[PDB]
Design a protein around this nucleic acid. Structure first.
Ligand SMILES: Nc1ncnc2c1ncn2[C@@H]1O[C@H](COP(=O)(O)OP(=O)(O)O)[C@@H](O)[C@H]1O
Ligand SMILES: Nc1ncnc2c1ncn2[C@@H]1O[C@H](COP(=O)(O)OP(=O)(O)O)[C@@H](O)[C@H]1O
Ligand SMILES: [Mg+2]
Ligand SMILES: [Mg+2]
Ligand SMILES: [Mn+2]
Ligand SMILES: [Mn+2]
Lengths: 368, 374, 381, 374
DNA sequence: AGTCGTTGCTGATTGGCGTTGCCACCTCCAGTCTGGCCC
DNA sequence: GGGCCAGACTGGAGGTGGCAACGCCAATCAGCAACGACT
């Protein structure tokens, strides 16, 4: 029995001006091909299927096309709602998805399901647990919910020799975050302790975009996004985990490298250094244009240095997406810094500054 | 953006169908071209067609629609304007037309027929007013409110940017720099303060304090506060451009909440002055330099490759006009095509490329050269 | 074989900040019951399924619930794009609906297909044609006029219909199958599409009109209309869904099925007294849900804060008022009979009388208004 | 109201003290006199000095007071403007001056000192700012908002009356014709209606009905309604004036609640259209005719005999400028004396007497002819 | 030991800002006519 | 010579916007009364 574990697809994410449609398509077809090759029994997607609560048209077409192509393969599939995914966007099509060997869970409290093998015999217990909204149920509340949900699954399994799998979309101690990772439970919880997970035979988690073994035990994993969703993780290869079970216990876990189709590179240093670093692509003729983040270390005006940057790039098969200085322009500074610069001109009493900062941050988060 | 061809039919004094195609033999050099002719001949009407076909508006008339249309010539049943422009190496066509009922001049005005289509592909991109306006704003980067301030300088409105309200100036700056999150923050802060105040009818005082700092409906306060950096970045380019146009003055940002630009008089021992005190010609040159800088502020995203201005040169003497024309000729080296409306004999003699809008006496109509007829 | 003809659902439409979710759900359930009762083979939805390109979540939920509950009956379903809904929005679910006994068409060029009966035998040739957007069927070219472009569009759409019907006939061949046709465009039996340009199909199920009617006296070309009242101008009219039957490869008959009204609405005219008299008819009725009213107060220069009056009149009633308006439009300006009169010569009372003479009031209030006006001149002196 | 003498000291680019007398050997014929010179020389400064002396205010600067004085020349501690004008055959004198603390080129702006006096006997009639403004308004009949519409036409604001909003046109007309009672009637009606309403009756209903007819705050509604006769008289006078200034167009009021004027193009079979469609030169001529009609309207109550046109002559072509100048000469042959500022080379020859203003080799200052030096 | 120059302390005006209504553009229709032909 | 049928429209209403006239509150300005500031 085999299961492919992936998460944080972030479908429909607009990377600056660019879009990730081609990357997502070339990932989904490869995933279907590898699923057929390894004759996997199920595919699990634990959170952040869509970049936002109102996905664009093409993202939904990609999702539906992938689900349709799944039928030709024969594997069962599970969808979970992440922190960015929204109920009434994944949960609205749930009833149609049932007819296509796919179960979609977005709201908590769903009873554990028996995941069938390719032959129709029971294979495991799923314990579908999506990103738990605090309003739907704190550290103990997550723990006892997990224990109670696992206990209910344990009662369902009885004495049958089947593995028990659990799901979750949450941050854990010892994890490494990124810029694209949106934080959760800003005012109530800081991190979940890895030792409070119920003794399930395997745990599938998302939220973190970097593959990590958490807590030191093998049966808990972060699978991470399948494509680079930020410029700080371009060089790291992305993984999808093919877990295996036998005689009701974990057998082995394997990492599969997702073939990169969209090159992305980050430049550094002064303009003189960048004029040499750009020669990596001189007359190379990369048929997919490379996406570049340029961390120029100068004090010159951004709206003036971008002109010469574009002039240098025009002779190369490259496309620059972002330029950042390592006087200031409004496109550079953070909203928090800009608001603080307003607070500085006002009286600098911390007793009110802390409350005003919290209020401004919660307002900005309500915009986002 | 640059204009490839202009086709108009029965607008103002230009009865008939006229097609002006640039990139021909006379306009191949991208050099200076001037539209000349008597007053009331329809010179501005040529520039009105370009704005009409693109943004369904003209500088003189707020809107043209079924309910009113004062642009189509009298004793005529239809009018249309169509322009070909090129953005990032790909050509597009905009089309706006209107016909009177039963083809009779007394008939009621029908709804306009608008389109937007690629020139080489031929595929239609938009067919409705709102769809066409939004798509062309996204494609060009600039809608009408930015076209009329950074690409076409209408008659008597060159000083619109300087004389505009700080609210309008900040809104234009956000439109060009795409920084509306600050306005959204301010607006929602004001809305939440109002909601808390009504729920009262210790959170209320803190909400009111934050509202007094950055809160305002439609985000006036925080927009104005945030756009100061953009104003400074614009002032830098404005000084760079103005150094060639008029060497006496330099620009410097006002140190006040209402974002404004002061001026530094280098001849008067660098004494700084308010911008209201400038002369007419000095204010025209300052506004021209500031508009050129405003079109250079977004050069990396969506470059603008043409500039049209309307009889702003009448306020300049024979020497300042010569300096301004030398600066414009030097800027023409960059490849920005400049079109000027004027009556000054000196500059009319200087510029060799002309579009003569000849006038027909008595009838009140006018015609171009025979080569532009169709 | 039997099919239904419906269109203009306009799912997700907001009607004066109100939502039609319950009404649409009730209509869909009734349609499912009717299909089960009448043993229908297919259902055709001629465009305007969604009221916008990006329908809200509950509209998509209703569409999904309908298309999943239709699986019990086993009857086919055809959904076409209108001028309202989005081609990409409908093409989102094309392949997923292809597994659910449902076919959706949004783009042009989709080849004719054979509708199977409930037992799987070939029943009819569908020949699906959605709302033909101009960007799909024509290529713009420079040097044309506003009417010439429309003429080219009409010629192109007529040619498209003719060619697609020829292909459908080629597909049919010899088997006695009625070639149904579909479209979502305006016909008048100019910018409209003439009815005589339609191909000689056995049936043409059109859309874009919310009122059920026959075009050109040809019973095989019909507008099914909306199944629910989408505006106050059609509140009192009954809504129909056509039930079409075919026999031996030719059209047999058309039957109109009344859609029961779920949310009652009414419109009122006249002065405030007439409004009160018409509201008297709802004094004691258990109304579930409350009836929605449009009130058009005939103007006699009452000029009062009528919103408060309506709120007070309808407060105790089981009535919710969505809109009230009045026809108060009139110009107010002086006509100078001759240039010899200047504002210094005319007295204040004379100017006020000139003002009042432009209003068509009577002596029942003219005397009192003149007295009130003279009181102002009295108190300034 | 005729300007006899003008004295100014250290305003804008005109350093030092100067006086211009319009009764000397030049200006004896009361003909056209053209203030000429390069841009930024102090031409507009002369008219600004006149306006400042009369009404403590400038077309460019909203107010000059104890603060924000920016009309005074740099590195200078005192400025003053004095004029002599004649009304009803007797002459007066107006004076406005401001000096810096301790007579330093920096320091606090002291409160300005103003006065108004007769030249017949030297008696001081008013010295307070408010009293001087009230007394000069009563004496002349022209406030600032009427002086700047009838006698002085600033550059770019010639069409201000044409493009003004209805409220500020009706308010101008009622004050010009001395028919202000209708505004007070609306104010009283609105106040009575509001007072009746706040107590909460059929009397309130009658008050509401009366308010809907004529009542409005600040007296806008009934004033706009009543001033139709005044606008018709004004447009009659303007049409009579315009027949000789520009023969193509006529003027008439439109059937609308807003006080607006439409043109009747006599060339195109009397096709009537709105003034928004007028060309720049045609609108300049229409506005000049309307200003002359404004002057002629009150000629039976208080006569104004001076007119100053700052700019807008450039908008006209040569073949029209000569006709406009011929009409101006015909008007000047009467008691009215008119002065025109322009840079166009055609007007250099036609006007023989010029108040030349010259800059000095980039020092930042300027001086006019030494014969005007004090 | 007399004169003036500069600076706070009070009424008025007044102009932006928010508020409540009040007018301009799309997308599907029922009411309004007007001329020709046959009995 | 009159009635019926066939063309040809058409302005119009439910949604969206923008702006207009008020009511309000913070800001500004012109007179007074000292207060200092010189010869
Ligand atoms: N609807 C119309 N029908 C006919 N002529 C018109 C119409 N609207 C404006 N005009 C005239 O068309 C001419 C346009 O001239 P314009 O381009 O404004 O001249 P300029 O370039 O000198 O400013 C003017 O004579 C104007 O009055
Ligand atoms: N406070 C000031 N001190 C000195 N010069 C000034 C001051 N304010 C304005 N100026 C200058 O005085 C000149 C006035 O020129 P102006 O009369 O407006 O010229 P024009 O008649 O060409 O319009 C300009 O150079 C202006 O910048
Ligand atoms: Mg000037
Ligand atoms: Mg012009
Ligand atoms: Mn996440
Ligand atoms: Mn994630």
């Amino acid at each position: 029995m085999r299961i492919l574990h992936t998460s944080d697809w972030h479908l429909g994410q607009n990377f600056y001006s660019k879009s990730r449609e081609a990357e997502h398509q070339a990932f989904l077809d490869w995933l279907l091909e590898t699923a057929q090759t390894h004759q996997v029994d199920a595919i699990i997607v634990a959170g952040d299927v869509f970049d936002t609560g109102s996905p664009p048209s093409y993202a939904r077409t990609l999702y539906n096309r992938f689900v349709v192509n799944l039928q030709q393969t024969g594997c069962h599939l599970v969808v979970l709602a992440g922190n960015q995914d929204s109920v009434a966007t994944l949960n609205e099509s749930r009833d149609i998805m049932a007819f296509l060997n796919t179960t979609v869970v977005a709201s908590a409290g769903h009873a554990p399901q028996i995941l069938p093998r390719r032959d129709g015999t029971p294979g495991a217990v799923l314990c579908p647990i999506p990103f738990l909204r605090p309003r739907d149920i704190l550290l103990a509340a997550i723990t006892d919910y997990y224990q109670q949900h696992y206990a209910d699954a344990c009662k369902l399994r009885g004495d049958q020799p089947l593995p028990i799998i659990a799901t979750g979309h949450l941050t854990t101690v010892g994890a490494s975050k990124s810029d694209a990772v949106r934080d959760i439970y800003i005012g109530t919880l800081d991190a979940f302790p890895a030792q409070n997970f119920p003794p399930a035979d395997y745990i599938a988690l998302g939220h973190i975009h970097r593959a990590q073994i958490i807590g030191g035990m093998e049966h808990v994993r972060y699978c991470g996004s399948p494509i680079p969703l930020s410029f700080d993780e371009c060089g790291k290869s992305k993984y999808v985990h093919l877990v295996t079970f036998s005689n009701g216990k974990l057998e082995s876990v394997e990492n599969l490298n997702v073939p990169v189709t969209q090159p992305m590179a980050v430049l550094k240093g002064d303009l003189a250094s960048i004029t040499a670093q750009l020669e990596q692509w001189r007359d190379v003729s990369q048929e997919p244009p490379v996406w570049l983040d340029i961390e120029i270390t100068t004090d010159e005006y951004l709206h003036d240095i971008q002109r010469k940057i574009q002039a240098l790039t025009e002779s190369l098969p490259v496309e620059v997406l972002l330029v950042r200085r390592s006087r200031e322009t409004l496109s550079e500074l953070s909203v928090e810094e800009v608001f603080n610069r307003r607070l500085a001109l006002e009286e600098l009493d911390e007793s009110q500054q802390q409350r005003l900062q919290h209020l401004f941050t919660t307002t900005l988060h309500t915009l986002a | 953006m640059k204009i490839l061809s202009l086709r108009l039919k029965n607008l103002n004094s230009l009865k008939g169908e006229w097609k002006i195609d640039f990139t021909r033999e006379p306009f191949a050099s991208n050099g200076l071209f001037a539209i000349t002719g008597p007053t009331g001949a329809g010179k501005t009407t040529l520039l009105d067609a370009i704005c009409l076909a693109l943004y369904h508006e003209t500088p003189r008339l707020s809107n043209v629609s079924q309910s009113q249309n004062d642009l189509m010539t009298r004793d005529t049943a239809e009018c249309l304007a169509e322009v070909e422009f090129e953005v990032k190496g790909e050509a597009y066509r905009a089309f706006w037309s209107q016909n009177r009922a039963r083809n009779q001049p007394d008939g009621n005005l029908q709804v306009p027929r608008v389109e937007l289509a690629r020139c080489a592909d031929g595929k239609i991109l938009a067919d409705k007013v709102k769809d066409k306006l939004e798509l062309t704003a996204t494609l060009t980067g600039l809608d009408y409110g930015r076209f009329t301030r950074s690409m076409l300088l209408s008659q008597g409105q060159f000083a619109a940017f300087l004389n505009a309200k700080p609210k309008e100036r900040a809104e234009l700056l956000e439109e060009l720099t795409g920084t509306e999150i600050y306005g959204q923050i301010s607006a929602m802060v004001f809305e939440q303060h109002k909601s808390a105040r009504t729920e009262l009818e210790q959170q209320v005082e803190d909400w009111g304090y934050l509202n007094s700092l950055i809160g305002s409906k439609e985000g006036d306060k925080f927009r104005k506060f945030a756009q100061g950096l953009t104003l400074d970045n614009l002032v830098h380019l404005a000084n760079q451009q103005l150094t060639r146009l008029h060497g006496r003055y330099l620009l410097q940002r006002k140190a006040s909440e209402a974002l404004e630009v002061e001026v530094v008089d280098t001849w008067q021992a660098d004494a700084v002055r308010d911008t209201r005190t400038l002369s007419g010609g000095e204010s025209f040159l300052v506004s021209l330099a500031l508009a050129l800088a405003l079109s250079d502020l977004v050069s990396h995203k969506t470059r603008i490759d043409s500039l049209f201005l309307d009889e702003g040169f009448g306020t300049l003497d024979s020497e300042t006009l010569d300096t301004a024309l030398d600066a414009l000729d030097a800027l023409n080296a960059s490849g920005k095509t400049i079109g000027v409306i004027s009556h000054v004999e000196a500059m009319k003699e200087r510029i060799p490329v002309q579009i003569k809008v000849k006038k027909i006496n008595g009838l009140g109509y006018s015609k171009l050269e025979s080569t532009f007829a169709v």
